[PDB]
Design a protein around this nucleic acid. Structure first.
Lengths: 81, 200, 108, 94, 96, 200, 200, 200, 96, 82, 94, 108
DNA sequence: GACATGCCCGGGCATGTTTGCCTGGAGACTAGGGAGTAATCCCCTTGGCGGTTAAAACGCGGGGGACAGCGCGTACGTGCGTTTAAGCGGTGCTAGAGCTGTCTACGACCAATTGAGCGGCCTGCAGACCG
DNA sequence: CGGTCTGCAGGCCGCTCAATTGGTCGTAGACAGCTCTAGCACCGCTTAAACGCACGTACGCGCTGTCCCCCGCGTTTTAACCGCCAAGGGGATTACTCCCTAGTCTCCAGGCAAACATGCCCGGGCATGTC
């Protein structure tokens, strides 16, 4: 797979900022946002995979994601806990 | 209504060797009366001629009489009086000798008598006995049955036994026999059916 | 051999005391668990549970809905100051956000 | 199914005692289950450390009571302490 | 003719997106992004459907909170438009 | 209500060799009455004919009578009086001889009597004894059971025993026998089921 | 017995927008009362609590009353008075307020009144109306049904409609709704059966 | 016996638009009652519920009555009074409202009246008319036919027409309709048989 | 004579204090502040000297870090002077 | 505050602290805002430390009581034991 | 007096491997003792949860190895893993 | 019995395997502890210890000291962004801070 | 002979009770932990006096902060056109989840050896006597 | 002044106590193999909402100018902190003895779900009447 980072479209970024109360957006925000999002998402993935590898599975489950998030100060409710 | 008692049905040949015989009629569609030895059963139509043969080893005394009476074959119904159904009891078919409610009649005999027993409420028909004619070993009485076995309020599809008693002047018992009776429409069809089912 | 009384019933609680007794005693939280400990904790959990549900039920009635949904839990937790500390960093599925609009953004 | 013991029954009963007419969505119930586990782990964890710091082997109502104060804001803490006090007080008395 | 004055649509969008609860990122693209990242560490990794949703909700929550803090930073500079500097400042203050 | 006593169910053949017998009816799903020797149990439909045979080694004196009474088989219910349920008690189905509340009736017999025992509160039905016909070996009485075993407020699914007593003209005990009774919609199905369970 | 008239079953929301509501109970084995919106039918166990909600668009005047009456759903049985069966009518289960023969009772309310209508012979139960408690959209009445639908001599497997009428202090009609009722041992099994048969 | 006159069978909707309707019952073998538009004929079992719908364009005045009467369809027999057969006339099946000899009864209705006409000798049954509830289009009366069409001495396999007449409080004719009736044990089998013979 | 402008020795102070390690607050005032706070929860409590020293180091570290973020916020507003609202912003971003 | 205990954190001391954080220039309002922030930090740490001390039923607060109290607020201190 | 433990001897030995001529102050030694204890608590705590989630009862080198990777930055993790690997490998051969 | 030898000597480690084994068996971390577990952990702690001490020794030398003091630990840790991250929430007694000045503050 | 008409047995559904499996509580016995008391003595608190930096205060001057104005661009809004996501469906297999069996491992205990601390003995440094 | 021996301070050798190591025994947790099923992965077709791109206009951001006050640095004055010292007792710590609680093992009752037993209604076949 390639370039799906662009799949986070400019309107999607608008809608997220809108939920955060943002009224007006400069064009460079789109590129900056994608970089930030990627790092956050990657770090969570890496931990969740590390758990999956410890269990010696080949499939990630929601609980791996929950643990991966949790330790970063991100307790998540609704997917089990 | 119900009777206070049940007449005896036991076969009793007595001092005269009394026994019953029946004609060798076929099983065609247009037949009015036919008998089955395999079933000891007579199949006949309403109001038609039913020949019953009286057989004996020796001749009973003069003044001997022959009585026919009907009872239900099933023991729980035995105390009910066999009579005609309310329809045939009301219809205008009396011959001038038989009371309207009697199931069994005798035809061709002027010396017939019909009894409604004050103590048992049973109906019966009686005629004098006569010894056989030249060329016969038996005496023939012609009965008529005046309701179908299926008559509702009457026999109501219940099988009946005709009891034939040979009797003296006081009504004491000289001999007794019995046979099952089905009064129907189509005795030939019905006899063949019951006789075919005897192999099934 | 008297007829038994379930331990939650004996305390007046709804939460099942015997479960907590097992749970505290595993996961290696301690070497030993005292008999009053599960009782105390069950009551605490029961109290906090009730407070969330009470607030969320009000939040459901404000939207005139008969059933509590994740959004109602979110509103309860963020409107209550203390819950917004205890659960401050919790993320809730389909929680949404409070309708916070900064005054400087309003039309004029 | 071979899965962990949920708290759904008791959560539902608690709601009925507070808002007798209302119901719960599956996702709301799942959230409450995660919530109970979270608070449980915190208290049990801190109570563990209290005993460890003090070189003592047994968790009692006190370790929980202390942990409750450390974890909960003061307002919630006092109400929780009152209830925990009563439950134990009654249970030993009855 | 009629056209809405710039910002008047934005305020109505802010209300709508704050009020609703659905996911703002299109799901199939996000799933591809997850896999596009994960492959760099391990090929052939399978994912549970639920796990992908868990990731997405955490991401949207993270970005939404980030934007609110970013918004305050721009307000502090007495702008209204947000700039990359505002994002960087907010993150840096949180030690990211 | 509850009785002051439980009738004895102990078998007693007495001076006359009194025993019971039953007909060899099949197990067709809804046969009106059928009996199981393996269980000593009768299976029958409500109000239908239930033939019970009386066997004796010698003929009891004239004036001898036969009585039937019902009790619950389970010991915890034996003190309750077996009666019809409040529904079948109110129904207008009396034959002009039996009281409305009695569970057991005898059909056909005009000389039947019904007793509500002033001391024990037990219901029972009585008839004169009659000897067999000359070539028969036993006498048949036809009972009717006027509620299902399942009748709520009545038998309420509890099994009953019918106790038959041979008695003199004053009610003195000449002989006693008993059989279990089930009054149900499908006596043949139910009998086959209870006989199959005997292998489980 | 029969009735001289049939109560009207027609739905009428009236000036106050009157409607019924029921609890969202499931269909598990251990259910005591459950309601089907697809059938407009309540399934419940005998003598268990059956909550019925009253909904209105505006509040009726003080002195308004709420009445419940049962009728048979099938038109030929509509003139028979729905009552308890003879067994449940005789059993000692009265609460001190309800007569022994009434099918429908209201629990928890001291202002309840039970009527045996002199002109129509119909049974009915009545209570005062009350507006919802603070924080509620509806008012709940707790009914009990005191016989199973299958009770012989009583409902005898015939389906019944419960008619609920909002009425003034004189008894004049303000609003009317109705629902079908089945009183049975396993409300969840039976409800799922009828909801499945809706696709057949 | 024979009547002095024949009732008019001519259809007459009158001022109120009077018409008859019947349910869309199927032809399962033993369906209790079923109706054929192709034959204008009801098929029903003896003594079972026979729903007949009364349709009107406007509501008749209070005191209006609905009468039912039976005549033979064949012109040779039209002068004979349709009555019960001698068996069903004697049997003890009166409901406390109907005379023994009447063929047609109305069930459920306490205000029924039975007339034996002093001039014509015709039997008929009458009830007050009642209007439907405002959103229902018809009123249903539930008749019972107390003999089979095959009853000998009664209908004797002869087809009958039931004539329904709407009347005022004095008995003046307001409307009239009619339908053929067969009373039989298997209405579904027989209806299919007669509808098949319509092609033969 | 010779003297510097407003805003010169202040910069030499930055170099000096960033280089050293000792406390920048006075000892006795801090002890009283600790006890005066502590008595609200419980009277008559005693303290180990090391306990007070621990509190001082934690407090100085906390404030110094807060000033760094505050300074960045002032730079973001393109000021040089720090304002109370600069502190408030940083704290709020950090979830306080 | 007793005898001006919070004011015991003097204006020059506040200056010196901000210097380590690179602060060049300071508005006069800063001093009171700083004191408020400082008091909250102390109140929270002291309260938790006392809670540990009470649990042990000791009457002197020790370094470990402080170290634990700090730790759980997300801040680990080295050198004072632990 | 009662008995106590610290890592001071081993810290001192390690320092002479990297800087044979350099001493260490007790204030610095205090820091190092706190550092060792902190890292220890983290690894032991995380390894405990790994066993807990996978329902094992026994901590092995694998749980420690995984915990190390979750705790440490990547570069330090690679070297730490290599040393732990050798230590266990050699210890098994020894 | 045989001539014994120390577990740390077998592993070539300076840190004491026996102590680590005892510690892992307590703290309520687990019901059971495997033989290689303390061996692996001791090596890791020893490795990280070496990294800090090496950088701190360099820092001490730049200040012409022949002895490590807390200040030198502080600087050494911050100068390696990996350790800075690992210890990103640690306060060092007498650590001081880094001599960083923002360019916008310098004169012109 | 063909068809028309009724009852019994079989099949299916409707309606209630008994049996089986899993979980929680109650009772009894064994070992350690917790609690209480006595004693020892170190550390904390309190108080004193002297020395001195640090803090507090006031003045003067300059830079920064603030407010207002003007210009041009970047963003927002809307229209028309294009693409892919979502929805629903179909097909194939890998891995997850659970069970059963067996072994090697770790826990536990006792015995032995080395390390650390303390006591006693020896060596170096400082002091005294001899050449 | 130079060389040799004795006492005190520091280091070394032996003993005591504790910790670590080695070896033996016991019981189970973990590893391994196997089986069954669910969910995930991959592909297709259709419908429409969302996304893309272009054009027009305006509000915002950016840069500049001008004004005033607040903050910085300096010098002088006052206050409190810091340093070292001394005294008293409370609290913490250590050791010793006694009682209760929790853990572990065995047994009984209740709660929840599935299967069987029994009643009621319709269809098929056979039995019997009509044409």
């Amino acid at each position: 797979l390639r370039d799906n980072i662009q799949g986070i479209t400019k309107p999607a970024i608008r809608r997220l900022a809108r939920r955060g109360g943002v009224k007006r957006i400069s064009g460079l925000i789109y590129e900056e946002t994608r970089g930030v999002l990627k790092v956050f998402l990657e770090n969570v993935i890496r931990d969740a995979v590390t758990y999956t590898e410890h269990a010696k599975r080949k499939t990630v489950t929601a609980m791996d994601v929950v643990y991966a998030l949790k330790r970063q100060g991100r307790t998540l409710y609704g997917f089990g806990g | 209504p119900l009777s206070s008692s049940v007449p005896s049905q036991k076969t009793y040949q007595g001092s005269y060797g009394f026994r019953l015989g029946f004609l060798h009629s076929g099983t065609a569609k247009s037949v009015t009366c036919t008998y089955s030895p395999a079933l000891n059963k007579m199949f006949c139509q309403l109001a038609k001629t039913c020949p019953v043969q009286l057989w004996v080893d020796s001749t009973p005394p003069p003044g001997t009489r022959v009585r026919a009476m009907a009872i239900y074959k099933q023991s729980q119904h035995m105390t009910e009086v066999v009579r005609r159904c309310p329809h045939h009891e009301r219809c205008s078919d009396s011959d001038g000798l038989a009371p309207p409610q009697h199931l069994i009649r005798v035809e061709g005999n002027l010396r017939v008598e019909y009894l409604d027993d004050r103590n048992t409420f049973r109906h019966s028909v009686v005629v004098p006995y006569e010894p056989p004619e030249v060329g016969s070993d038996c005496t023939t009485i012609h009965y008529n049955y005046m309701c179908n076995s299926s008559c509702m309020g009457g026999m109501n599809r219940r099988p009946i036994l005709t009891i034939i008693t040979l009797e003296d002047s006081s009504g004491n018992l000289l001999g007794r026999n019995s046979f099952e009776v089905r009064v129907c429409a189509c005795p030939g069809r019905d006899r063949r059916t019951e006789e075919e089912n005897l192999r099934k | 051999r008297a007829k038994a009384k379930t331990r939650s019933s004996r305390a007046g609680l709804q939460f099942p005391v015997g479960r907590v007794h097992r749970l505290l005693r595993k996961g290696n939280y301690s070497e030993r668990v005292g008999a009053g400990a599960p009782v105390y904790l069950a009551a605490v959990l029961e109290y906090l549970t009730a407070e969330i549900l009470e607030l969320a039920g009000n939040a459901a009635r404000d939207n005139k809905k008969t059933r509590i949904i994740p959004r109602h839990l979110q509103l309860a937790i963020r409107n209550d100051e203390e819950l917004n500390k205890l659960l401050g960093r919790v993320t809730i599925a389909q929680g949404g956000v409070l309708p916070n609009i900064q005054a400087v953004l309003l039309p004029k | 199914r071979s899965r962990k013991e949920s708290y759904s029954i008791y959560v539902y009963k608690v709601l009925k005692q507070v808002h007798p007419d209302t119901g719960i969505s599956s996702k709301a119930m799942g959230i409450m289950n995660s919530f109970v586990n979270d608070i449980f782990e915190r208290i049990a964890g801190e109570a563990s450390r209290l005993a460890h710091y003090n070189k003592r082997s047994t968790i009692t109502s006190r370790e929980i009571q202390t942990a409750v104060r450390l974890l909960l804001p003061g307002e919630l803490a006092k109400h929780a302490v009152s209830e925990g006090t009563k439950a134990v007080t009654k249970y030993t008395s009855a | 003719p009629h056209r809405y004055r710039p910002g008047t649509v934005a305020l109505r969008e802010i209300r709508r997106y704050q009020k609703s609860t659905e996911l703002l990122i299109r799901k199939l693209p996000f799933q591809r992004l997850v896999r596009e990242i994960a492959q760099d560490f391990k090929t052939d990794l399978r994912f549970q459907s639920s796990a992908v949703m868990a990731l997405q909700e955490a991401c949207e929550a993270y970005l939404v909170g980030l934007f609110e803090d970013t918004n305050l930073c721009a307000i502090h500079a007495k702008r209204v438009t947000i700039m990359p500097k505002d994002i960087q400042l907010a993150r840096r203050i949180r030690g990211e």
